[PDB]
Amino acid sequence: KVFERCELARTLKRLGMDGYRGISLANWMCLAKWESGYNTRATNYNAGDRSTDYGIFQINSRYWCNDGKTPGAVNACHLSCSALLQDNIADAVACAKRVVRDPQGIRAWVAWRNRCQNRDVRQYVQGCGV
């Protein structure tokens, strides 16, 4: 599914994302916006290293989920990458929380550095009741 902006904001808030390991809701929104356009079903193959990015946060198969087909990979979220293509984003959120328990936190995603870091991201949550 493709979330509407404010629907997603509230959904993430219910799932405990607001301020998780220091990360505001507007940061998570900015990440989802630029990774996927708020789209849970998105996959992107990285021909360079044979990994794939999955779902609304575009979580990568080399480190985070198992797809069977990524050489040398591990699965720190202990999930099938299939779990990250559901309309229900609970598993994706749990896996995003796992990513940001590592030292880089939200910097793990390059798109966040590019599109969100050191910016005014308040627009992402404006009017959403969060």
Which position among 4, 7, 18, 35 bears the catalytic label? Answer: 35
Instruction: Return the residue of 12, 79, 92, 116 that touches Cl ion, per CB under 5 A.
Output: 79
What is d(CA 130, CA 121) in angstroms, rounded to the nearest whole number?
Answer: 14
Is-catalytic flag, 35? Answer: yes
Task: Determine, following the binding rule CB under 5 A, whether residue 83 of this chain makes contact with Cl ion.
Answer: yes
Stretch that binds Cl ion, among 5-13, 49-57, 86-94, 101-109 (CB under 5 A): 86-94
CB 120 within 8 A of CB 104: no
When asked if residue 87 is in the footprint of Cl ion (CB under 5 A), the reply is yes
Q: Where are the alpha helices (DSSP H) in the chain?
A: 5-14, 25-36, 90-99, 110-115
Q: Which helix (H) or strand (E) holds 54?
A: strand 51-54
Q: How far is the CB of 48 from Cl ion (least distance, A)?
A: 26
Min CB(21)–Cl ion separation in Å: 12
Residues carrying an active site annotation:
35, 53
